[PDB]
């Protein structure tokens, strides 16, 4: 048979299928998608004018900036790909330093300075490991905002311009969120944060390709009123949406969660071969523990003082971790692996 659908030319128009629940929905609106698994092929950050960028780093370094920390994982890949082109620009301009770009290890730590746009000592270090002779507080950070999108099949370019002043808030041009009925997402080039209402609205699972340190902009937040920072599962300082969707009954903010892993997967389920029980007799909440010993022994029996099941768990490169509230029932013994 025949049906009736509203379409608009300047919105997301099309038909879309949901296999479970067997719902074909067609119309026009906003399609918020999970960009984390496809990002390396789908998106490429690109600076507006390598010449204008090169002069601003010179002007920064003259004003005492030794280096940069990338805000996002994409931004780091950008500095790697452009470094050969920048250093060629610097030599023609007799600038007395060169630009070196290192890996992205763990949390994308936060720098305190800014690179102002234009109209030992010898290296301007981008990223790499943490270094005291070029400390974070001497480095610029979160210096790009999106100017325009390069819309296409296959690759999409994201052209960025240097900001005019410093800001701790993530760049909202890259961010999105959406909710319909009883599912909700906050989403990013690197975060995918799912919450749903089963009797009560709560955080259901998340996917992290990077762990960053910008603040999540309120303007792209669901339910951002009356949030208590101590109750945000994903901590505000690592970009947790300041939202009641970022809650989970019986858990508090995972400031000591395994965020060092730099890339990890959060949801609510037991780790393989362990059990968690709700026991007031448990140890107090503390820094997150790995369910596998330093010696590969699995830690069988866990408990939590007043959390709620299923237990908050993180999955990482080297194994499975439980939220801070979960503790070994045999108390501190053995060869334990703990986060910071």
């Amino acid at each position, epitope marked *: 048979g025949t049906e009736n659908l509203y379409f608009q030319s300047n919105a997301d128009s099309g038909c879309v299928i949901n296999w479970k629940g067997r719902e074909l929905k067609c119309g026009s609106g906003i399609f918020v998608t999970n960009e984390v698994h496809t990002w390396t092929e789908q998106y490429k950050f690109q600076a507006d004018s390598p010449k204008r960028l090169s002069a601003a780093i010179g002007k920064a370094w003259e004003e005492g900036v030794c280096g940069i920390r990338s805000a996002t994982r994409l931004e780091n890949i950008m500095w790697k790909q452009i470094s050969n082109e920048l250093n060629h620009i610097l030599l023609e301009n007799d600038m007395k330093f060169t630009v070196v770009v290192g890996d992205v290890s763990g949390i994308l730590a936060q720098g305190k300075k800014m690179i102002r746009p234009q109209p030992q000592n010898t290296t301007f270090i981008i990223d790499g490991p943490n270094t005291p002779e070029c400390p974070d507080n001497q480095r610029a950070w979160n210096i790009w905002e999106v100017e325009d999108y390069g819309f296409g099949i296959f690759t999409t370019n994201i052209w960025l311009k240097l900001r005019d002043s410093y800001t701790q808030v993530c760049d909202h041009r890259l961010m999105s969120a959406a909710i319909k009925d009883s599912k909700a997402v906050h989403a990013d080039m690197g975060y995918w944060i799912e919450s749903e209402k089963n009797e009560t609205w709560k955080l259901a699972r998340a996917s992290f390709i990077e762990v960053k340190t910008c603040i999540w902009p309120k303007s792209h937040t669901l339910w951002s009123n009356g949030v208590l920072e101590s109750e945000m599962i994903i901590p505000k300082i690592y970009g947790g949406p300041i939202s009641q969707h970022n809650y989970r009954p019986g858990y508090f903010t995972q400031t000591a969660g395994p965020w060092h892993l730099g890339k990890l997967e959060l949801d609510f389920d037991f780790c*393989e*071969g362990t059990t968690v029980v709700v026991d007031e007799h448990c140890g107090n909440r503390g820094p997150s523990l790995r369910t*596998t*010993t*330093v*010696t*590969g022994k*699995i830690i069988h029996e866990w408990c939590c003082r007043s959390c709620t099941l299923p237990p908050l768990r993180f999955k990482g*490169e*080297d*194994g499975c971790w439980y939220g801070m509230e979960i503790r070994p029932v045999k108390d501190k013994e053995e*060869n334990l*692996v*703990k986060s910071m």
Partner: antibody
Amino acid sequence: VQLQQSGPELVKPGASVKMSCKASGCTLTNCFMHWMKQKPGQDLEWIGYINPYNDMTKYSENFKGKATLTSDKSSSTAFMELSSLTSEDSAVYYCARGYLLRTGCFDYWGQGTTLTVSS
Amino acid sequence: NIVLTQSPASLAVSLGQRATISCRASESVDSYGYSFMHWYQQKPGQPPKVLIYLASNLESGVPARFSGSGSRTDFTLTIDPVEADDAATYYCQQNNENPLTFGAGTKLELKR
């Protein structure tokens, strides 16, 4: 935890071989079968690992195109296959129980499968 | 990658003496407060066998004359007193970061 590796192999250049490693006494939480290549009296190279129950696999960069890890749960067996074969591949391939990244050591080892690549 | 360089390449020691082998890593092998370093003994024609796991832990059922020490980049295997059985090659290995890497080896030769 007892590891039994396949027998020796003689293979023509450019062909392919698939050797096996069955693991008795394992649990889901351990039982990462690591694979190493050792030419006679030379350094061991790490290829990767596979968990017969999890299908978790990780390859080293040097071997990404060369080796392919597969698994059969019921057999709790690991399989490693070596793509286009060259004389540089003639060596002993060791199977050995390990763990994830910052976890444990090489507890137990299979006996080793010797491969000779020759026309 | 983390490259382990072992010294010396080959060692000759008399019965009952003290043997010292060292392993030098290109990057720290330390994480979570542990040193992810191990020592192996390989008799010829045989799989390797673990002696020290982590920097300084005697493997279960390995004679207590074997001992390990160190942190970060520098580590040392000590055999005391070395006996007739220990004629073998000795490997260090790290699993702090992928790929797991081994030392080149130290061939121990006994002096009698």
